Motif scaffolding. Structure first.
Motif, PDB file in Angstrom:
ATOM      1  N   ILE A   1       0.854  -1.180   0.000  1.00 18.61           N
ATOM      2  CA  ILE A   1       0.000   0.000   0.000  1.00 18.61           C
ATOM      3  C   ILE A   1       0.891   1.231   0.000  1.00 18.61           C
ATOM      4  O   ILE A   1       1.895   1.280   0.718  1.00 18.61           O
ATOM      5  CB  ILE A   1      -0.949   0.012   1.219  1.00 18.61           C
ATOM      6  N   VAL A   2       0.542   2.217  -0.815  1.00 23.10           N
ATOM      7  CA  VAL A   2       1.207   3.512  -0.760  1.00 23.10           C
ATOM      8  C   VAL A   2       0.617   4.321   0.389  1.00 23.10           C
ATOM      9  O   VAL A   2      -0.598   4.537   0.450  1.00 23.10           O
ATOM     10  CB  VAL A   2       1.050   4.252  -2.094  1.00 23.10           C
ATOM     11  N   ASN A   3       1.476   4.788   1.292  1.00 17.03           N
ATOM     12  CA  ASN A   3       1.023   5.607   2.405  1.00 17.03           C
ATOM     13  C   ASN A   3       0.791   7.040   1.921  1.00 17.03           C
ATOM     14  O   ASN A   3       1.018   7.371   0.755  1.00 17.03           O
ATOM     15  CB  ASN A   3       2.045   5.565   3.543  1.00 17.03           C
ATOM     16  N   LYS A   4       0.297   7.884   2.830  1.00 12.60           N
ATOM     17  CA  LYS A   4       0.080   9.296   2.532  1.00 12.60           C
ATOM     18  C   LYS A   4       1.376   9.998   2.158  1.00 12.60           C
ATOM     19  O   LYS A   4       1.430  10.750   1.179  1.00 12.60           O
ATOM     20  CB  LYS A   4      -0.540   9.984   3.735  1.00 12.60           C
ATOM     21  N   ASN A   5       2.433   9.765   2.926  1.00  9.62           N
ATOM     22  CA  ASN A   5       3.726  10.380   2.661  1.00  9.62           C
ATOM     23  C   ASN A   5       4.571   9.593   1.667  1.00  9.62           C
ATOM     24  O   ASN A   5       5.790   9.783   1.652  1.00  9.62           O
ATOM     25  CB  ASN A   5       4.484  10.574   3.974  1.00  9.62           C
ATOM     26  N   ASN A   6       3.943   8.709   0.882  1.00 12.36           N
ATOM     27  CA  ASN A   6       4.558   7.943  -0.202  1.00 12.36           C
ATOM     28  C   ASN A   6       5.583   6.948   0.314  1.00 12.36           C
ATOM     29  O   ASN A   6       6.562   6.650  -0.366  1.00 12.36           O
ATOM     30  CB  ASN A   6       5.179   8.847  -1.268  1.00 12.36           C
ATOM     31  N   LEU A   7       5.374   6.442   1.522  1.00  8.79           N
ATOM     32  CA  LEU A   7       6.181   5.354   2.051  1.00  8.79           C
ATOM     33  C   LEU A   7       5.482   4.045   1.723  1.00  8.79           C
ATOM     34  O   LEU A   7       4.293   3.885   2.008  1.00  8.79           O
ATOM     35  CB  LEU A   7       6.394   5.496   3.560  1.00  8.79           C
ATOM     36  N   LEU A   8       6.203   3.128   1.087  1.00  7.34           N
ATOM     37  CA  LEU A   8       5.652   1.812   0.801  1.00  7.34           C
ATOM     38  C   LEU A   8       5.385   1.052   2.096  1.00  7.34           C
ATOM     39  O   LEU A   8       6.202   1.064   3.018  1.00  7.34           O
ATOM     40  CB  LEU A   8       6.620   1.029  -0.078  1.00  7.34           C
ATOM     41  N   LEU A   9       4.231   0.395   2.170  1.00  7.14           N
ATOM     42  CA  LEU A   9       3.850  -0.358   3.352  1.00  7.14           C
ATOM     43  C   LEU A   9       3.388  -1.742   2.941  1.00  7.14           C
ATOM     44  O   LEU A   9       2.944  -1.959   1.814  1.00  7.14           O
ATOM     45  CB  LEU A   9       2.733   0.335   4.130  1.00  7.14           C
ATOM     46  N   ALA A  10       3.472  -2.672   3.880  1.00  7.18           N
ATOM     47  CA  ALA A  10       3.069  -4.047   3.648  1.00  7.18           C
ATOM     48  C   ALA A  10       1.871  -4.380   4.520  1.00  7.18           C
ATOM     49  O   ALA A  10       1.904  -4.164   5.734  1.00  7.18           O
ATOM     50  CB  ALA A  10       4.217  -5.011   3.944  1.00  7.18           C
ATOM     51  N   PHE A  11       0.815  -4.889   3.899  1.00  9.90           N
ATOM     52  CA  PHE A  11      -0.275  -5.527   4.619  1.00  9.90           C
ATOM     53  C   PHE A  11      -0.069  -7.032   4.529  1.00  9.90           C
ATOM     54  O   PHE A  11       0.108  -7.572   3.431  1.00  9.90           O
ATOM     55  CB  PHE A  11      -1.641  -5.138   4.060  1.00  9.90           C
ATOM     56  N   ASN A  12      -0.084  -7.698   5.675  1.00 11.87           N
ATOM     57  CA  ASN A  12       0.290  -9.097   5.761  1.00 11.87           C
ATOM     58  C   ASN A  12      -0.744  -9.828   6.607  1.00 11.87           C
ATOM     59  O   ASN A  12      -1.579  -9.211   7.271  1.00 11.87           O
ATOM     60  CB  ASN A  12       1.705  -9.231   6.342  1.00 11.87           C
ATOM     61  N   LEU A  13      -0.695 -11.163   6.540  1.00 12.74           N
ATOM     62  CA  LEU A  13      -1.575 -12.006   7.345  1.00 12.74           C
ATOM     63  C   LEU A  13      -1.365 -11.783   8.838  1.00 12.74           C
ATOM     64  O   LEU A  13      -2.332 -11.766   9.607  1.00 12.74           O
ATOM     65  CB  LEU A  13      -1.344 -13.476   6.999  1.00 12.74           C
ATOM     66  N   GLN A  14      -0.109 -11.611   9.259  1.00 12.05           N
ATOM     67  CA  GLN A  14       0.219 -11.511  10.680  1.00 12.05           C
ATOM     68  C   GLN A  14      -0.382 -10.260  11.306  1.00 12.05           C
ATOM     69  O   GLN A  14      -0.953 -10.312  12.400  1.00 12.05           O
ATOM     70  CB  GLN A  14       1.732 -11.516  10.863  1.00 12.05           C
ATOM     71  N   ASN A  15      -0.256  -9.122  10.617  1.00 13.83           N
ATOM     72  CA  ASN A  15      -0.929  -7.902  11.048  1.00 13.83           C
ATOM     73  C   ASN A  15      -2.443  -8.060  10.995  1.00 13.83           C
ATOM     74  O   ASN A  15      -3.167  -7.433  11.774  1.00 13.83           O
ATOM     75  CB  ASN A  15      -0.472  -6.738  10.172  1.00 13.83           C
TER      76      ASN A  15
END
Lengths: 293, 99, 299, 190, 49, 274, 253, 299, 49
Positions: B45-59
């Motif tokens: 997922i692209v964050n607001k401040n354009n930092l790449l983020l990961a959505f995962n099963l564990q979260n």
């Protein structure tokens, strides 16, 4: 465990002796269908055969228990040859009567102090706690035979009313027949099965038993107590339904409806209705008044 | 008071499977993995401040490890408290019959 | 604001009556009418507590709880000038009651009807042929203990009239005659006789307390057995051991079913009417007391 | 901007302010140098930047009535002072023409100050270059600030074993499943 | 998802639904997870182990 | 205290004023990942064994000291079978798998609108050929129905916002049934729908709204807009490289290009996608 | 706006009352038997913690030696046997004026009314109690409960196995259920007291006594000030707008 | 010093509602928070007493104690104008209620939830989809009577359970059911199940009852045991020549002053507490009354 | 949010990067030869903000 000292400080000073009994949930699976509700209102009573008859009604609270160090006892906590009966309810529609017997208890009370015992009425293993402060065959049968005698008389009474009416039928309930079959006048197949099941159905909580026990004159005169057991034994039969009809419409239902005045009605699929008469001696009224009320 | 706060709802899927005939449009990518067997297990997922983020099963387990998934009693109650259920004709195995 | 009101007398007062009122200026009165100026019979407590008819105590309690209290300010030949008491205003008190009773700073004043002799408590007005009766004011724990001792004395005197052997009167007198509060020793004489007839002030509180104390354990065992559930407060179970055994042994089947409702209901009425009595009626606090000036700044 | 600060200061608002600090720091620093690449945007960008700067300064003085300095033509008052260096001054006069009456009369004891004037948005703003007199004392000019910002770069990392790629051209032949970097390259100042 | 629900025939009272747990991942219906999903999950399991 | 009272009346019958979004000043809530925990939502329920429940609570379930991005967004999860098509997620659609437009159907007919929302004998108005993408959520008594319907759960702690509450509540869906002029008036005259709070850490449900201004159009249309979703680094790297020719669907990996009414400038290093 | 508060004057001997004490702590008065015109023997709660046995370090730094206090209350060990010590602790209110004298000392407090000073046109003050030995009984058991107008500060004095201890409770609901909620609060300490109950006779059964000090302006809360004594670092809760209305000791069990 | 609150209605109510609400002018209702502008849901009592839920009276006493009470002053089509209650100010009051009890001069008043009749005290607002629920204000003795009745019913509906019908026909419906008054008899609403809340109050009652049964004096039991057989009285008419054998089993020990003094002392310390376990309602002292107007001057 | 720290030896108290560039050292040479990473790894100058 707290229930024992609660009784000993309030009810044990009203009743002389107590035997403290713990019931597994597997034994609870006998009475209650498809439900695991907590057993607070459960009423234990005694009932002794062949000498005299009496019940004393008391609540011992039940809670599920992890306190046994043995893994096997994980579960709920609440003249020998005679009966005790636990009557279990909740706020909803669930009433069960469980029968504990002696010679599992007097042998079982022999040394977490615990010992396994067997049920005679509904065979499973139960567990008996002992606190540090501490003619066979005719005896169970009576509650069977008594009630089944009633069934025979009721069935015979139906025959007498059919003997009134030239042995055919009359329809008292507006139910349209499912279709005008040619192969329907073998309904002799149906009525025979009535006298199959009515004689092979006996339980303490029959409809006419509750019809015998009436709180008021007017409202039971205005109220009907019905039970429908299915034909030929598929499934679980229902007793003690109140009518404060659709039963005649749907098949698989030999409907039976009793008024408080003892008048009965056997209703067949297709709305055919036969009236039946009840005969109760004051001994029978005394017995039903003792247990049911 | 003109400075209004407008409130939106977003959604995105993760954990999906493509059917048996598998096709690519882009010619640029050359991944080593065999295309038949591969399956996505996570999202970016692209964050607001354009930092790449990961959505995962564990979260995702902070909802997946709760009793409201597992217990059927309210599903059963909402299913049978209706006037007409499905035509009750089903009879086979349902309970074992002892010989 | 200005709330001083005057009662006007029918006849001229005599000189003895004038000096008797000058003795008791700064004390409290019951005031039957919210508006002050009206006839003399209102300000007296003689309608409830009279020389003629034997008074029951709860009548005086119900009368004092309702009616307002007033403080005398001035006595003149044809007029009595009174000050009404309203909460939220500060006033002055002198302790011209007779039985001297020490008033401490920040103590709790309580107003209770007098158990002493009538001649000690009242003034008779021969001129207007009426009676004015002054309600007693005494400190709160002392007034508690006064009620305790006179009640226990009524119980012991009625028992010794019932059966002379069981009760020794000297053991009653030695204990109940003395009242000790904060190093001050006051000897109070008990009621003189109970008699066969209805006795002077008590026998109504005593019988109410007696019916209450006999119904209490019989009601309590029934309540404790009725209460048991899950959600009940746990300390109850801890107190289940606390009851004496013979009180625990009682079966509910003996007393009949509707009589349970009768005994419980009567016991509850007696409890609720009885409990507010021991808070001791009207109450006030005093900021500062002056012993040599004998003046209490009250509110 | 009062839009961001209207709700008072909170954790989220402080964080968004820090994020916009980072954004404006990357984007609108050295604006006059980035004016070269824009081409046809010569004037409008510089006008917007200087007008935004004038807008940032509050226009409220608590004394509420302080008398003002005025242009030599008179009327409208002098709003601000831009202090620059010499090459910057020449470039600003090239992009922004239309020099007004330089001779500003506003200071009292009338004197022809010669504070080069430009008209920005609504207001007359004077632009001044003080580099010459500090050069004539051989002392460095204090507007020539020196910025120190840090850099960081990694070397020696591992790519995870489901290797992927995007560029079709490159052929390294290193048999790419087993390849790993051991050194890094930096592009010099020159 | 986790359970399977069915209806028994009614006898004297209208029958209520019943749920039995699927217990395993492969007890999912094939419309919800096909065989291709299963073998790909198996290969991913093998690479993980 | 000085009191001053004003009176207002509207002269013409039809609308004489119009408000319009013009220019985005800021995005306050970040679009990051923050899954809402249900041990906070339902603290009262438990499993059988104490040890096993303690383990499950300790491993997964476990104020914030500081945040750099902004107000965190609560993420709620709906389970969905794995054969769900990509093309349902690329276009504006409700998470339930069925259309939830109550405006179309006839006014004041609760049974008709509930037929469209909750019957599956007839397909949804979004797609004729399928009935529903995930029947684990759409149908009555399914897991989505249990999960996010208001007032059926009855044991959730109030004060924690739920995004799927606006989509699964039967009451809030049923209220839209009336005539559309009533919707237009009630949209701006009244607030409601339980909107989330502003300028806190954990985004609670609103109570005061003292000078707090919400306008929420998605409650009216009953959909949610898709976001940028990438199954792997490869597709997001190519999509940052080339806009036009990028694959929306690879062999097994997929990408959803963000369909948002606010187009957002995406910057990675020195390459820009806008 | 209300009528000016009824002040009370007190003459204490200066050795049992520190000059250093902050303006606004509530004070409690003890009754002497034969002489009481001379020494009032007023207590402060920090003194009461010493007469009953990092609060302890401050309570020992201010008050040194105790046998003067033991002389003032000689029968404390007899009173804790009989539960009669609560019958002597009367509440008086927060402190206003402290006129300094060598042997005697002049304490002026507020018996009743809104708390204030007297010199200028009625400068207000605040009432302070330390946050330890203080339990908010609103955050203890916590549709939406209603927001009342006014909040009450109660005092309780409780005879535990380690002697008697006092507590101050802040709630806003009502007097008829603060008793029940206070029994629910002191349930586990009651569970620890009935070890040695059975030999001891009827008079010991009382667990404590509750008075109602006053009603401070609710819907605001409190603050957290401190003590500025030399070593102190002592956190203290302070409340404004206080209206003192000391009540009677109502028994709890 | 100025008490005034206006409640802003969301949408206009009809003329049929404004007529009956203007009929209801001058009556007490509870409000949720002390603000100038209030939401309508906190204004009505109906939040604590929904139609669908089981009726729970003691929790409504809990709700009504916390909620600052107001008097309806003006009913307007978008506005409900209320003044409030400072404890120390005097304001007029009016009584117009359907279960109707005529008030007395200097008889204190208490506020209660509407036990008697659901439709009688309340008016629904279907235009704004709420109900405004007026509470019941009564003189104190009959109020305490109804409180005792509800508590004894919360006991005995647990006690009867199922098995004796002869308990059920009289116990559930005779004392607990009807509230008598001079020339009048009024029904009570009886909960179908005895629900929550009252049972914790019964727990605290049981705690006090066990502690009180620990400390009972014997001499009063002697007075009862003597008088019930040797003499006859109206107070003793509950007790015939039969005595409960309980008091005979407690009646074996002799009498002594020193024990009964201390027992009475501790019972004095504990009967003070029961006033706050009993009261539960706000008290209003009546200073003037207008029978022709049904408009009193409370305090 | 999903990870705690990219480089665990860099962050933690007492860790290697900490011990390299905290103010915890004093054996080191005088102030000359300025350290860049000094500006990243002080406690006091960090908490100044």
């Amino acid at each position: 465990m707290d229930v024992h000292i609660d009784n000993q400080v309030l009810s044990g000073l009203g009743t002389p002796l107590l035997v403290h009994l713990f019931v597994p949930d597997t034994v609870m699976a006998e009475l209650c269908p498809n439900r695991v509700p907590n057993c607070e209102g459960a009423w234990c009573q005694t009932l002794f055969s062949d000498r005299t008859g009496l019940t004393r009604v008391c609540r011992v609270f039940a809670a599920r228990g992890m306190l046994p160090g043995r893994p096997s006892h994980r579960g709920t906590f609440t003249n020998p040859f005679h009966v005790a009966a636990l009557r279990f309810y909740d706020e909803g529609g669930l009433v069960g009567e469980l029968q504990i017997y002696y010679l599992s208890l007097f042998e079982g009370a022999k040394r977490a102090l615990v010992r396994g015992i067997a049920h005679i009425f509904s065979p499973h293993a139960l567990y008996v706690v002992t606190y540090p402060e501490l003619s066979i065959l005719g005896a169970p049968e009576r509650e069977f035979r008594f009630l089944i005698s009633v069934a025979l008389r009721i069935s015979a009474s139906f025959r007498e009313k059919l003997a009134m009416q030239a042995w055919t039928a009359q329809q008292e309930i507006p139910v349209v027949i499912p279709t005008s079959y040619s192969r329907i006048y073998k309904n002799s197949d149906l009525i025979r099965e009535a006298f199959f099941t009515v004689q092979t159905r006996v339980s303490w909580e029959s409809c006419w038993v509750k019809a015998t026990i009436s709180n008021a004159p007017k409202t039971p005169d205005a109220c009907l107590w019905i039970d429908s057991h299915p034909l030929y034994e598929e499934g679980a039969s229902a007793w003690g339904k109140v009518i404060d009809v659709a039963l005649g419409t749907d098949g698989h239902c030999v409907h039976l409806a009793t008024t408080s005045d003892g008048q009965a009605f056997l209703v067949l699929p297709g709305g055919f209705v036969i009236k039946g008469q009840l005969a109760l001696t004051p001994e029978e009224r005394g017995y039903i008044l003792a247990r049911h009320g | 008071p003109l400075n209004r706060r407008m409130q939106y709802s977003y959604y995105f899927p993760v954990g999906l499977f493509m059917p048996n005939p598998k096709y690519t449009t882009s010619a640029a990518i050359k991944m080593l993995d065999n295309p038949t067997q591969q399956l996505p297990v996570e999202a970016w997922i692209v964050n607001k401040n354009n930092l790449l983020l990961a959505f995962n099963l564990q979260n995702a387990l902070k909802v997946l490890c709760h009793p409201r998934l597992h217990t059927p009693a309210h599903t059963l109650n909402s299913l049978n408290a209706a006037p007409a259920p499905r035509d009750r004709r089903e009879t086979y195995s349902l309970q074992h019959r002892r010989p | 604001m200005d709330l001083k009101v005057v009662v006007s007398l029918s006849s001229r007062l005599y000189t003895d009556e004038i000096a008797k009122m000058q003795q008791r200026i700064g004390c409290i009165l019951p005031l039957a009418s919210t508006h002050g100026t009206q006839n003399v019979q209102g300000l007296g407590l003689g309608q409830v507590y009279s020389l003629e008819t034997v008074p029951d105590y709860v009548s005086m309690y119900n009368y004092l709880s309702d009616c307002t209290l007033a403080v005398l300010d001035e006595v003149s030949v044809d007029s009595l000038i009174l000050t009404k008491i309203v909460p939220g205003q500060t006033y002055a008190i002198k302790n011209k009651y007779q039985p001297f009773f020490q008033w401490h700073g920040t103590g709790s004043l309580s107003v209770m009807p007098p158990v002493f002799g009538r001649e000690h408590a009242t003034v008779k007005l021969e001129s207007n042929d009426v009676d004015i009766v002054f309600p007693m004011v005494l400190p709160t724990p002392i007034a508690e203990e006064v009620l305790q001792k006179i009640l226990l004395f009524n119980v012991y005197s009625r028992v010794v009239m019932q059966a002379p052997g069981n009760a020794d009167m000297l053991d009653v007198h030695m204990h109940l005659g003395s009242v000790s509060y904060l190093g001050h020793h006051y000897e109070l004489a008990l009621p003189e006789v109970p008699g066969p007839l209805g006795l002077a002030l008590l026998d109504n509180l005593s019988l109410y307390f007696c019916i209450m104390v006999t119904l209490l354990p019989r009601a309590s065992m029934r309540l404790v057995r009725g209460l048991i559930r899950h959600e009940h407060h746990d300390l109850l179970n801890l107190f289940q051991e606390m009851v004496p055994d013979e009180i625990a042994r009682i079966d509910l089947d003996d007393l009949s079913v509707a009589d349970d409702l009768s005994r419980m209901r009567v016991m509850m009425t007696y409890l609720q009417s009885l409990a507010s009595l021991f808070n001791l009626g009207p109450r006030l606090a005093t900021a500062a007391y002056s012993q040599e000036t004998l003046t209490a700044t009250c509110w | 901007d009062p839009t961001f600060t209207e709700r008072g200061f909170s954790k989220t608002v402080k964080s968004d302010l820090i994020a916009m600090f980072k954004r404006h720091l990357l984007e609108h620093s050295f604006f006059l140098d980035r004016a070269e690449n824009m081409g046809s945007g010569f004037s409008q960008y510089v006008r917007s930047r200087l007008s935004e700067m004038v807008a940032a300064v509050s226009g409220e003085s608590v004394l509420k009535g302080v008398s003002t300095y005025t242009t030599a033509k008179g009327g409208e008052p002098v709003g601000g002072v831009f202090i620059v260096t010499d090459n910057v001054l020449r470039q600003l006069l090239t992009f922004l023409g239309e020099e007004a009456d330089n001779q500003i009369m506003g200071p009292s004891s009338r004197v022809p100050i010669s504070a080069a004037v430009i008209k920005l948005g609504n207001h007359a703003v004077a632009v001044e270059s003080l580099q010459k007199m500090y050069n004539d004392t051989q002392s460095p000019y204090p507007l020539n600030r020196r910025m120190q910002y840090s850099y960081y770069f990694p070397v020696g990392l591992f790519m995870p074993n489901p290797k992927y790629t995007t560029s079709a051209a490159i052929k390294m032949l290193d048999n790419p499943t087993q390849q790993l970097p051991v050194e890094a390259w930096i592009v010099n100042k020159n | 998802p986790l359970y399977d629900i069915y209806i028994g025939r009614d006898a004297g009272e209208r029958a209520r639904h019943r749920a039995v747990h699927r217990l395993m991942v492969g007890n999912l219906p094939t419309p919800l997870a096909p065989a291709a999903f299963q073998e790909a999950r198996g290969q991913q399991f093998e690479t993980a182990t | 205290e000085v009191h001053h009272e004003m009176a207002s009346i509207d002269t013409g019958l039809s609308y004489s004023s119009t408000m319009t979004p013009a220019r985005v000043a800021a995005i306050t809530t970040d679009m990051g990942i923050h899954t809402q925990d249900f041990f906070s939502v339902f603290p009262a329920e438990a499993f059988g064994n104490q040890q096993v429940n303690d383990y499950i609570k300790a491993k997964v379930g476990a104020g914030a000291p500081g945040l750099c991005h902004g107000q965190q967004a609560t993420c709620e999860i709906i389970v969905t079978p794995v054969t769900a098509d990509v093309a349902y997620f690329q276009k504006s659609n409700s998470p339930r798998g069925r259309a939830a437009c109550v405006v179309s159907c006839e006014n004041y007919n609760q049974e008709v609108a509930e037929g469209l929302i909750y019957d599956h004998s007839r397909p949804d108005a979004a797609y004729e050929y399928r009935s529903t993408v995930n029947p684990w959520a759409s149908q009555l008594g399914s897991l989505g129905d249990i999960m996010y319907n208001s007032s059926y759960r009855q044991t959730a702690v109030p004060g924690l916002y739920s995004p799927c509450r606006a989509f699964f509540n039967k009451e809030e869906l049923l209220r839209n049934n009336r005539g559309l002029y009533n919707m237009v008036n009630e949209y701006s005259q009244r607030l409601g729908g339980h909107p989330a709070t502003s300028n806190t850490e954990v985004q609670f449900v609103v109570i005061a709204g003292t000078d707090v201004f919400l306008e929420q159009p998605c409650s009216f249309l009953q959909e949610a807009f898709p976001a940028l979703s990438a199954s792997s680094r490869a597709l997001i790297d190519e999509f940052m490289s080339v806009k036009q020719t990028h694959a929306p669907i690879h062999y097994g990996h997929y990408i959803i290009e963000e369909v948002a009414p606010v187009r957002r400038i995406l910057k990675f290093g020195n390459k820009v996608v806008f | 706006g209300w009528r000016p508060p009824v002040f009370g004057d007190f003459l204490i001997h200066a050795s049992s009352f520190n000059n250093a004490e902050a303006t606004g702590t509530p004070l409690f008065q003890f009754k002497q038997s034969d002489p009481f015109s001379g020494v009032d023997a007023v207590f402060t709660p920090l003194s009461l913690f010493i007469l009953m046995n990092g609060l302890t370090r401050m309570a020992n730094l201010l008050y040194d030696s105790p046998a003067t206090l033991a002389d003032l209350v000689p029968d404390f060990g007899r009173l804790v046997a009989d539960r009669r010590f609560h019958n002597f602790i009367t509440p008086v209110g927060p402190l206003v004026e402290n006129i300094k004298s060598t042997y005697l000392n002049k304490i002026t407090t507020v018996v009743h009314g809104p708390v204030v000073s007297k010199a200028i046109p009625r400068s207000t003050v605040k009432v302070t109690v330390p946050q330890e030995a203080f339990v908010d009984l609103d955050a203890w058991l916590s549709g939406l409960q209603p927001c009342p107008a006014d909040a009450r500060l109660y005092v309780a004095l409780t005879y535990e196995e380690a002697g008697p201890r006092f507590t101050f409770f802040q709630s806003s609901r009502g007097h008829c259920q603060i008793m029940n909620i206070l029994r629910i609060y002191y349930s586990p300490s009651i569970m620890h007291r009935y070890a040695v109950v059975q030999p001891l006779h009827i008079e010991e059964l009382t667990f404590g006594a509750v008075a109602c000090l006053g009603t401070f302006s609710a819907t605001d809360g409190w603050r957290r000030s401190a003590f500025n004594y030399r070593g102190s670092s002592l956190p203290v809760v302070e409340i404004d707008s206080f209206y003192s209305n000391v009540s009677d000791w109502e028994v709890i069990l």
